[PDB]
Amino acid sequence: KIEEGKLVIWINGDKGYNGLAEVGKKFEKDTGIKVTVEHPDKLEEKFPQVAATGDGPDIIFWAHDRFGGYAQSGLLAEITPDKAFQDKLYPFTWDAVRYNGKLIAYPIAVEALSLIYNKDLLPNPPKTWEEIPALDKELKAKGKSALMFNLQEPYFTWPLIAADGGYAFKYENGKYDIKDVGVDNAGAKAGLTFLVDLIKNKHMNADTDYSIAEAAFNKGETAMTINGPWAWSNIDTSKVNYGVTVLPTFKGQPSKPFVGVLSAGINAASPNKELAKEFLENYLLTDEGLEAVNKDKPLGAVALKSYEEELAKDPRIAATMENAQKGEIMPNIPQMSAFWYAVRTAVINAASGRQTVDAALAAAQTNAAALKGNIRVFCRIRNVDIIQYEAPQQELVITRNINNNFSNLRFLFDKIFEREQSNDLVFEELSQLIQCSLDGTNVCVFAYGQTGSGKTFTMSHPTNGMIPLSLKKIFNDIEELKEKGWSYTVRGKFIEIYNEAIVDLLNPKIDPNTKYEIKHDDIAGKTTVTNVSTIDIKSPEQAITILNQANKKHSSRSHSIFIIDLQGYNSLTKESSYGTLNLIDLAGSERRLKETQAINKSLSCLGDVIHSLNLKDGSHVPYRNSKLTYLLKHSLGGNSKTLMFVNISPLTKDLNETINSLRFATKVNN
Ligand SMILES: OC[C@H]1O[C@H](O[C@H]2[C@H](O)[C@@H](O)[C@@H](O[C@H]3[C@H](O)[C@@H](O)[C@@H](O[C@H]4[C@H](O)[C@@H](O)[C@@H](O)O[C@@H]4CO)O[C@@H]3CO)O[C@@H]2CO)[C@H](O)[C@@H](O)[C@@H]1O
Ligand SMILES: Nc1ncnc2c1ncn2[C@@H]1O[C@H](COP(=O)(O)OP(=O)(O)O)[C@@H](O)[C@H]1O
Ligand SMILES: [Mg+2]
């Protein structure tokens, strides 16, 4: 638990935490209340984790964008400033920390990105992004470079991506429309394409991160960088004469940075809430409190009117607010984290050359929007006492006549297939996902349910199972894409997981000590299993034959995984792609004890993993916990797409296992 009678504070490592610690010392000196300031890594991810338990800091600092999520999860206390105190802060800063009509944090300062330039290398910085390549060539001839900035965090790249029309959520009326996302529109593609072109032309390096960019600029090696107010003090102590100015325009339009309000929230589980308020209102949010923090790392444009007025003629702060005015305040809705995770992955994938700009943003768009989503769950009622069900719009309602009362259990699916609806109709939901794989976005297709429910019929029917149809579709699409300069190779692996052991179902290695280790490349997001044999697929018919034979050999008590790797190269654009389609026929889920124990653990872990992924909020994803999830790690996370068929029997006698299956389903569908 949290210690009553103390304050523990968490703030990010890039802010002036030593200055903040000074404030805590004054608070301790006056009140006897000890204040401890900490800057743990990934604290914005740890907070929701520990605070869910009733642990964590009394006070948490972060930009306002994260706080809506915390509030929706009940992790924050409503703050209670009176009107005399509210009047001391700008109204627009109070707006940033209001969620569902309630104030959920104290606003501290307004932050936006600006262009920072070396006045000696570059007396007249470029007004446009478009000039940068030529400027870089000139500087390179003096052993310098034009621009270096953090490319790992979408916060830094977004202003360019937004310039020509990109946006997170359409703003119409009160509400941000979580169904209208602007991540893959023409504006966003244009911006990201420009960024990627800079990298292709060697004006920037895909690997550049915060530390690299900072050392480069502060050492006088690059002429420009892009950063926020917190970075100024390190430049002050450097030898560089720098200026802070408006970001470059793109296609004549201003870059639009996301505007953040550094905010301080109170842990709902703190037994120190009144003390936290005294500290925040009477010590931090004062001229002297803010100056202590500001002198450590600059805050930007502070929320406190008196001190803001005092610093207003600082040209760096003026530049900050000009860029701010041109950008947009960040939404604080829980969905923002989904947005950020999605865009982070897209940018990294495009910038590194692993995926085209279009394909990267397409996948991020889907992950970030409340539409079809990344994880799709379907119920398939096998064709056939038959249970009494209705499938209204989609909802499954099962009615039991429990001697002698009427029970109605309800379950919500993306779609429900039932009597005689063919494999060809079901495959229409998987069909468009094939193009995703060809574009390098990974895909998993699971069939789940009790033995007899129809998993293998769905996945492996020799004419129209999901496997044969997927192979058929892949080859059709590959042929069409030749017209656009693409050539692809198709490789398959067929493996089985039984009681946690991997068996190559194609080439069963003979050495008894032969190991099948799952080995990830967390850089490229690739995975191989040591010693599993791969076949080069020349036709669907060929692969289907091999798989038919490989089967000629228990299946109901193990996972069967068919892994198709798609590798493309385009001779016209010189681009590359690597995508994986995983087709999984799961072990039966029905309730030999070793088998049973292992299956339950595996299936339960699968559900744990999918559920967390669906929260898209950064909760822990325990891939290690099973060979299945560990194997499929890089086709489950990121902007990967998953399809889950929950197969069920229509027989009254199977009602209990059907209900178990259906309950698993609602867990993974969120
Ligand atoms: O697993 C991947 C990574 O996940 C973690 O980072 C996430 C955050 O959890 C998300 O909250 C989000 O971050 C946003 C952030 O919310 C937003 O306020 C802004 O961050 C600025 C910040 O306002 C500013 O004050 C200053 O500190 O710089 C920040 C940017 O670095 O923008 C963020 C997005 O870039 O998204 C990220 C993922 O992109 C985790 O921390 C990472 O370690 C992890 O790699
Ligand atoms: N939707 C369906 N329509 C008609 N027959 C089916 C359907 N699903 C399964 N079957 C039949 O039921 C039997 C058992 O199905 P199967 O796919 O083996 O279940 P599981 O793999 O889940 O144990 C198979 O012989 C199959 O032909
Ligand atoms: Mg089967």
Side-chain angles (χ1 to χ4, degrees), residues 2 4-5 7-24 26-28 30-33 35-41 43-54 56-141 143-169 171 173-174 176-201 203-294 296-324 326-371 373-381 383 387 389 391-392 394-401 405 407-411 413-414 416-418 421-431 433-482 484-490 492-506 508 511-514 516-518 520-522 524-551 554-573 575-590 593 595-668 670:
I2 311 159
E4 183 180 12
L7 293 178
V8 173
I9 305 192
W10 285 6
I11 179 163
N12 204 33
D14 58 7
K15 303 310 192 303
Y17 52 78
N18 286 320
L20 183 58
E22 286 181 19
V23 183
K26 188 174 183 174
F27 191 73
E28 178 172 8
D30 290 357
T31 69
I33 308 297
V35 175
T36 299
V37 170
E38 313 195 341
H39 49 103
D41 288 311
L43 75 85
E44 83 286 9
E45 295 180 349
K46 290 181 194 157
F47 181 69
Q49 302 195 341
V50 303
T53 296
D58 298 270
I59 300 165
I60 175 73
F61 281 76
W62 196 264
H64 75 283
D65 66 304
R66 264 285 192 169
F67 283 82
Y70 300 160
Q72 189 67 32
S73 299
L75 298 187
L76 298 178
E78 184 173 359
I79 61 162
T80 64
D82 66 16
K83 277 151 111 174
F85 186 86
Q86 299 174 48
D87 286 344
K88 290 163 147 49
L89 279 59
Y90 290 108
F92 88 90
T93 67
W94 289 121
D95 296 341
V97 298
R98 193 175 282 114
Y99 182 71
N100 287 359
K102 292 178 164 37
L103 302 172
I104 49 70
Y106 289 88
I108 303 293
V110 181
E111 311 169 349
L113 292 172
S114 299
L115 182 64
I116 302 171
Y117 68 99
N118 181 328
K119 294 212 281 232
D120 293 304
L121 292 185
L122 198 61
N124 305 296
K127 282 296 162 179
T128 76
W129 279 94
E130 288 83 345
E131 301 148 351
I132 296 196
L135 177 62
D136 183 67
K137 297 181 186 84
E138 300 201 357
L139 288 169
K140 286 273 165 70
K144 303 293 181 195
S145 69
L147 172 66
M148 298 185 59
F149 70 100
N150 183 8
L151 296 184
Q152 313 311 301
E153 286 292 332
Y155 180 72
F156 294 80
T157 46
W158 189 251
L160 165 61
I161 302 179
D164 193 43
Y167 60 89
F169 306 101
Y171 194 55
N173 292 313
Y176 289 100
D177 183 351
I178 74 179
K179 293 193 162 194
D180 188 349
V181 172
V183 165
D184 71 349
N185 67 29
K189 284 165 181 176
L192 187 52
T193 297
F194 190 89
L195 189 78
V196 174
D197 282 346
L198 287 172
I199 294 166
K200 289 180 177 172
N201 292 318
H203 304 309
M204 297 196 302
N205 188 302
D207 291 325
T208 298
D209 63 19
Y210 192 91
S211 313
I212 293 171
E214 182 177 44
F217 183 86
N218 301 359
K219 279 199 273 197
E221 289 170 356
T222 187
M224 293 173 293
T225 190
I226 290 167
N227 219 318
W230 55 86
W232 302 337
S233 54
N234 285 346
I235 320 185
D236 288 349
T237 61
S238 92
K239 284 172 163 34
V240 169
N241 298 293
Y242 72 95
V244 181
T245 191
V246 59
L247 289 157
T249 66
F250 176 61
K251 301 175 77 186
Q253 306 312 291
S255 292
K256 306 174 56 209
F258 258 139
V259 184
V261 178
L262 176 66
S263 297
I266 298 175
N267 196 326
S270 174
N272 295 308
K273 291 183 185 66
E274 195 55 32
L275 289 173
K277 172 179 176 174
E278 194 183 4
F279 173 78
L280 291 174
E281 294 190 7
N282 291 2
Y283 288 78
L284 182 57
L285 285 171
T286 58
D287 288 350
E288 64 265 25
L290 289 187
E291 176 185 66
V293 176
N294 196 68
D296 186 355
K297 297 299 183 61
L299 281 163
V302 302
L304 188 80
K305 305 180 188 179
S306 55
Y307 191 50
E308 188 276 336
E309 299 185 351
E310 174 167 346
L311 302 182
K313 301 181 179 187
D314 188 337
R316 304 171 303 170
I317 300 179
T320 300
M321 291 311 279
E322 172 167 12
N323 283 310
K326 281 157 160 143
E328 313 260 331
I329 196 53
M330 281 181 268
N332 68 5
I333 57 179
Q335 288 74 23
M336 270 300 288
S337 45
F339 165 80
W340 284 129
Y341 287 112
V343 176
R344 176 183 210 274
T345 291
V347 178
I348 287 178
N349 286 357
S352 62
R354 279 192 291 279
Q355 199 160 30
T356 69
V357 162
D358 290 354
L361 291 177
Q365 167 82 17
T366 289
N367 210 16
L371 299 186
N374 59 326
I375 292 113
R376 305 175 177 69
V377 182
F378 308 115
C379 176
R380 193 177 193 186
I381 309 170
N383 202 9
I387 59 178
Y389 69 88
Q394 197 172 356
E395 228 197 8
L396 186 75
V397 178
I398 295 186
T399 293
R400 293 176 298 173
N401 200 306
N405 195 329
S407 190
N408 295 328
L409 301 180
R410 293 182 172 74
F411 307 88
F413 290 83
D414 299 318
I416 304 177
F417 308 93
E418 47 196 300
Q421 281 179 317
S422 72
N423 282 347
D424 301 279
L425 181 62
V426 174
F427 175 80
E428 291 194 1
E429 310 306 336
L430 168 56
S431 190
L433 268 41
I434 302 304
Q435 188 55 236
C436 292
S437 296
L438 292 163
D439 286 322
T441 299
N442 304 326
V443 173
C444 291
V445 183
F446 298 97
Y448 174 114
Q450 68 178 137
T451 295
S453 61
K455 299 183 293 307
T456 303
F457 176 93
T458 297
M459 300 291 300
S460 299
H461 193 298
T463 168
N464 59 3
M466 300 302 107
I467 288 176
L469 296 178
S470 298
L471 287 160
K472 183 179 200 284
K473 174 71 168 130
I474 284 168
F475 274 76
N476 169 88
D477 287 14
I478 281 183
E479 180 65 8
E480 297 188 357
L481 300 167
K482 281 193 179 79
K484 295 145 80 167
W486 289 99
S487 67
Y488 287 84
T489 59
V490 186
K493 291 185 292 301
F494 194 23
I495 69 187
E496 167 198 277
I497 301 168
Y498 182 62
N499 302 326
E500 216 173 26
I502 288 175
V503 155
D504 185 338
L505 277 66
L506 295 185
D511 189 288
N513 279 344
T514 180
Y516 294 115
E517 229 153 298
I518 298 170
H520 300 302
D521 178 344
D522 292 345
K526 287 194 187 182
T527 305
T528 69
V529 188
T530 64
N531 294 308
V532 176
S533 79
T534 294
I535 56 165
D536 284 313
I537 304 176
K538 311 296 187 188
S539 67
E541 292 86 352
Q542 175 212 13
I544 294 183
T545 287
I546 284 127
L547 296 175
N548 278 350
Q549 300 177 349
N551 277 340
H554 181 142
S555 68
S556 60
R557 307 318 293 171
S558 62
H559 306 324
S560 307
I561 307 118
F562 179 42
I563 305 174
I564 312 171
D565 293 317
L566 304 175
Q567 178 164 341
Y569 179 67
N570 189 295
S571 58
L572 292 169
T573 67
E575 294 173 318
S576 269
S577 69
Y578 195 88
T580 298
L581 168 59
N582 310 269
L583 302 139
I584 305 107
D585 187 347
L586 293 164
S589 56
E590 59 276 16
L593 177 63
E595 286 187 358
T596 275
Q597 274 174 347
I599 296 178
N600 174 70
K601 272 155 180 165
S602 183
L603 293 189
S604 171
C605 177
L606 176 59
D608 286 332
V609 165
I610 299 174
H611 175 75
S612 311
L613 289 175
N614 253 102
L615 301 175
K616 299 180 196 61
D617 77 315
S619 301
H620 180 72
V621 188
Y623 301 104
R624 305 272 316 184
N625 283 133
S626 79
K627 294 312 171 103
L628 180 60
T629 49
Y630 193 63
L631 176 75
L632 301 179
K633 183 171 103 151
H634 288 300
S635 293
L636 290 170
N639 290 329
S640 298
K641 287 161 174 143
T642 288
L643 197 156
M644 165 81 57
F645 291 119
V646 176
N647 301 92
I648 69 158
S649 163
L651 298 184
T652 302
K653 74 180 185 69
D654 293 319
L655 237 164
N656 283 332
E657 286 297 359
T658 293
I659 294 176
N660 292 345
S661 283
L662 296 173
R663 292 169 158 175
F664 180 77
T666 53
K667 172 197 171 94
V668 295
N670 202 28

